Paper text:
Accordingly, it has been characterized from a number of bacterial sources, including Brevundimonas diminuta (Bd; formerly Pseudomonas diminuta), Flavobacterium spp. and Agrobacterium radiobacter. The present study focuses on Bd_PTE, a dimeric metallohydrolase that has a (β/α)8 TIM-barrel fold with two Zn2+ ions embedded in the active site. Carbon dioxide reacts with the side chain of Lys169 to form a carbamate functional group within the active site, which serves as a bridging ligand to the α-Zn2+ and β-Zn2+ ions, both of which are required for full catalytic activity. The buried α-Zn2+ ion is ligated to the protein via direct interactions with His55, His57 and Asp301, and the exposed β-Zn2+ ion interacts with His201 and His230.
Apo structures of the octapeptide-tagged A53 variant were obtained using three different crystallization precipitants: AS with glycerol, PEG 6000 with MPD, and PAA, which resulted in crystal structures A53_2, A53_3 and A53_4, respectively. However, A53_3 and A53_4 crystallize in space group P21 with a dimer in the asymmetric unit. The presence of the octapeptide in the active site might be expected to interfere with the binding of OPs. This indeed explains why no OPs were found in crystals of A53_3 and A53_4. Additionally, an unidentified six-membered ring ligand (X3E) was observed in the active site with two O atoms, likely acting as a chelator that coordinates the two Zn2+ ions present in the active site of PTE.
Author numbering:
A (entry chain B): 26 to 365
B (entry chain A): 35 to 361
The structure:
Amino acid sequence: ISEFITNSGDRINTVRGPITISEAGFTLTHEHICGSSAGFLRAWPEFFGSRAALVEKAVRGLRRARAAGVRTIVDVSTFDAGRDVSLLAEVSRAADVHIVAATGLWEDPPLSMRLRSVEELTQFFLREIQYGIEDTGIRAGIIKVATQGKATPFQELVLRAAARASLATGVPVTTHTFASQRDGEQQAAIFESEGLSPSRVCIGHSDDTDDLSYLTALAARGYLIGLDGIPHSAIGLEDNASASALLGNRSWQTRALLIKALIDQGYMKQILVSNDWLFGFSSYVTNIMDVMDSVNPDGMAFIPLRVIPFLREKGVPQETLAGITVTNPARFLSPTLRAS
Amino acid sequence: DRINTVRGPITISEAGFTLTHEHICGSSAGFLRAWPEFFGSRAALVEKAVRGLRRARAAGVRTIVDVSTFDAGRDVSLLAEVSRAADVHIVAATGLWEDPPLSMRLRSVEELTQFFLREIQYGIEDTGIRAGIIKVATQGKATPFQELVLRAAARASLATGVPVTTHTFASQRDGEQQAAIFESEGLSPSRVCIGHSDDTDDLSYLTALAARGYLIGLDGIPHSAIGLEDNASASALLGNRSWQTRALLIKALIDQGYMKQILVSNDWLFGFSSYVTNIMDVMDSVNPDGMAFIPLRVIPFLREKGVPQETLAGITVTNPARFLSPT
Ligand SMILES: C[C@H]1O[C@H](C)CC(O)(O)O1
Ligand SMILES: C[C@H]1O[C@H](C)CC(O)(O)O1
Ligand SMILES: [Zn+2]
Ligand SMILES: [Zn+2]
Ligand SMILES: [Zn+2]
Ligand SMILES: [Zn+2]
């Protein structure tokens, strides 16, 4: 009964305020409006044409995803990935797509973050969840962390601060990995040493690897498996070294068949799916957004328009795919009880 | 005849006593807006900076050059607020310092030139405030990216006439490589201040650069961890050379004939998030005068050493005006 009720119930924080779990609907759990650096969009909007051009591009892309069935995206851009929650709020209002914002730290923390203690980082993550991001009053609904191989000492502090902020607030944790180095195993160990439940943790970029034994072992432990870069592929771009390095030479079909593989092995309840798409991208080579748009014009609509029909004709039931894209994110994003 | 400040253009005569290398807040891009509680609050940081700049004003300072770049967390709206409430002119900087994020590190020399030009010719962010100086940095031999920054800085200077000021590891003679790259872009040494030059005792390094026409930034005079020997992080940052040793380098360059090429400053801050947490309190504990240290302590020290008042006025008024005036 309660799956049909939207006018009441517990709530998820978005850039427009709280929404009921029922209102979240079809949710992409790992996306970006703009992948940049702190302060960069405000200091150099002409890099993106203009701020107005970036807004219009993102609103059009979100409307395309909405027409394909998407109702919510989780923008997992952190402070150091150039998250501008005022941009997120504007595009969310114009496109009528819910956007959950993130705290945490990604791969490019400045000195003012890298010098901080685990206790200090915990306070910063709590600030963005409990008080608001900058002076906007927009509260983060997820904590994003990253490793690229064995964690640096600072990344260990970030992982522990994320776990502590998660336990204190009930909001979940989502991660960036070098999946080929099995990063999720060390991340899980650090999280478990802090007492975090695996059901509150998504191990991301997990479709970057073909090692099913690594994925199934984490899923068996209760971790959520983020198969979040399905359209990332440089097939056809083999002469472009920067695009090939970023997007890989594995096909979207290969990535999508990892979804089916985990389903077939009984782990559908542990899967989250996304595009890891962007509408602007300044933290890499200059032409990269144009290159990416050239091989995936559907943008964030790729999951509903391409991956769902592909898996359905492979025999995955529609209700299973709805469970992965609607119910699984709702359980993940719903805040659990705070500790104590 | 005009210099851009955070309150708009001023004439050269209005700059007066100028501190050429200072910071309202040494931070990181976006950090002051995302975590103002690190500084107590934004309001507390404003009040502290206004109290400190008012003290420097009472000691005779009329202008400071805030050489915080984008990646040092420059917030020009903060600079404007503090400048207005302390009635001290503040010149803002473009360029890049020692902590550029990916969105900067991945850019070409052409792209960096466009960004520096934007901040000088159009404005910083959406504020309309235009930079009056370009700040660059090396820490020993330049990285490939720092070479691009130095070249883009030279190109932006040649297009606008605003000068270039540098951060160096003086002990590794970085001013020589900076000079070489600047001259390979056709930049005139008289448009360049080689900063942190008081961090070294090698007078022959400094006089050779000045004999080539460079301005010499003796800009960290109160930086000293004397008395803080049990503090490893403060000692590493501030050094164990005394302020008197640094100040006597001013006299030495005057005595060697370079008074017209010396720029003096404190390299002080009112907030500081890019190092260890307690560093601002530690620094305030040994230099409560803050930015007033140059006028209150260094000027009388040099006067009693025999430096004429006209020479000290030339260093603190004439040289910054000549340096900051766009060519
Ligand atoms: C900023 C964004 O760009 C990449 C495509 C992937 C990421 O998720 O690591 O972050
Ligand atoms: C004092 C110390 O922090 C400042 C932000 C910059 C510096 O490089 O001048 O050194
Ligand atoms: Zn990532
Ligand atoms: Zn991502
Ligand atoms: Zn410096
Ligand atoms: Zn400085």
